[PDB]
Amino acid sequence: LIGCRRAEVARTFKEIQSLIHVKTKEFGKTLNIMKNILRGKSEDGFLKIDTDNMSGAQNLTYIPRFCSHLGLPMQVTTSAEYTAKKCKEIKEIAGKSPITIAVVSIYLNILLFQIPITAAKVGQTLQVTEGTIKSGYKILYEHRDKLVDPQLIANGVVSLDNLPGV
Amino acid sequence: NAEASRVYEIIVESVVNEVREDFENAGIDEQTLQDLKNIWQKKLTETKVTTFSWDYLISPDENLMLCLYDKVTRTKARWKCSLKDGVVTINRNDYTFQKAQVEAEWV
Amino acid sequence: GYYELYRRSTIGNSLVDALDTLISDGRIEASLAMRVLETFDKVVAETLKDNTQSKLTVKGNLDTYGFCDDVWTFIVKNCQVTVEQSVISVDKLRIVACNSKKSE
Amino acid sequence: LRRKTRQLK
Amino acid sequence: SFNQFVDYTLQDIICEDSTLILEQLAQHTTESDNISRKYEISFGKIYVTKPMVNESDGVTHALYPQEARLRNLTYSSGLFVDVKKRTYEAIDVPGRELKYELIAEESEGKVFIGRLPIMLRSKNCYLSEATESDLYKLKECP
Amino acid sequence: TSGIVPTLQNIVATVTLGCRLDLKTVALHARNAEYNPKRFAAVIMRIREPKTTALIFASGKMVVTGAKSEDDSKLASRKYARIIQKIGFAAKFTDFKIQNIVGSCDVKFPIRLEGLAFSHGTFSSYEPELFPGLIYRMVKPKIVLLIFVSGKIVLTGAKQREEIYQAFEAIYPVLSEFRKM
């Protein structure tokens, strides 16, 4: 996980748990201890500026891989990346896990681009509860104007009425 | 309760059907089973409950319940008790069940 | 061996009030007494699970609760019960319960 | 002491 | 030769060593654990994708030979075999012949086994079905 | 300075009763006493008036949790020891040491947690996959803090009041700089 985060290519905890059968508590404690001793060795040796490489969220780096798992086109992926970037401004979902934020942004832009993929398929592919995805879409329906890229709706490729209401 | 009545009926019938071989293995007379059933029925009738046809320390005519629990979970105040296979004697009236969801809040 | 709870019930106390008479009359020995009580407990446990279909559930306020020797004791007060509906208000109710794990 | 697992062609 | 290899020889190589059986003996000191297990992993049909590439971040996209030459990639396609898992159990009675039965754990399921490099203008390659204008669009010389 | 003082919600303390205790009898005779030796090697009791919970061990060691103030924990330990006196054991009260004082508060503004984790990276560990709160480990005093997007702050690991209060007073300027909207 540290090697994935350092190369700006970070996977999630679920990925590493899918490969390595390790309990969540011991893996988190081990990650914390190794981050502490890595910072200590950096201070003792060559000091390294983090510049958002040990970032806990890193939700911009999950959008292309998660869109590839669903077989989405690129413009859906960049719209989802913009939506996930603008989701940080929303204080109601700022505490959500970045996997859930990425998934609800992807699902919002799937409904925006009329891609025929159901919430059940997104939940099955990315192992997020369908109720969680539906609640995230419901809580993001009030902020439709800020999340959707203004230049996309300006060019007319997508329109805000395509999103079903709650 | 007629359901408790037939439950107690099959209790007394199964007991007096099963005790007989123990009484014969003990060698005592067969009348010791019949009068036992008779006095058991007289005491159930004089119990007058069920119809028949025959400073912090712990220290009959009491509402109690005897049962078997599958899982009991505790929260800050609430108590889930999933009791099973019990008999009740509240208000001098007998009841029988298979499941019991007991919820009570801890003060 | 199995659990021993139903002696405190109406049929149980009626039976243990009748075996004491035969104890006093010199009709039953001690060994026969607790083996007939054990087989009565086995009989009531085995036929109380198969051929009954009633239901009960209780809401209330528990006063004193305890778990020792693998039994659960509850003293719930101001409690209302429902059978299968009919509602009964009970001022105080005592619960004694055991595990489904077999002893010995 | 017996081998726990073995190959089967 | 390459089309013969992809169309027929890959399945033959898969089917020649498809079954993989591991017999776990009972190894029982007492007769309580006199059960022997037999785990079988069997490969089935092999599937080949169109040529593709996975990047660092995990996004996988269709790879065309012009991009593979420029980015120093390998023009390859994925191989996926169907794997069925069999678990057998037998009562290990000495003298009595073992008779194994399924415990209905027959879980089966394409699994990725590797990347076969694709010869250009072969049947798996994108350029085989491309017309002259399609080749000019892909910056491939006709 | 800060306009709000944190309020305590749990104080964990210990008492040495100084006598070997038979956990079998204290479970049967005390009212709210739970003893499951397979599950746990102690007896759990709780009494209503301080809303606390005592873990009593065979060696006479005692743990009191759930108290709001140190006087409340002292009174709770007093009454549990009085229960042990009334149950038939010579449990002399010997010492009372409070180990944990966890208190919560609210700064009443949203917090940018990723920026706080990036800036004070030597004391912070933000992993929103596991837990949605930031773990800030102050070196002086040794108080750990759970920081949230709603502004709720949980200060944990204090021995008396003058660690959690100054921990909040020191953590307020480094959270006032991070504001959302």
Added chain:
Amino acid sequence: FNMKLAINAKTITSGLKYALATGNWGERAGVSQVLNRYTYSS
């Protein structure tokens, strides 16, 4: 038992890639050669 750990796809991938990148055919040299692009007839 993890199937992702059971089947190491890098074995097949690296074996084919190594035997095609180098001329070595095993584990015969010169089997794979860099294609000549001096002229079309070449």
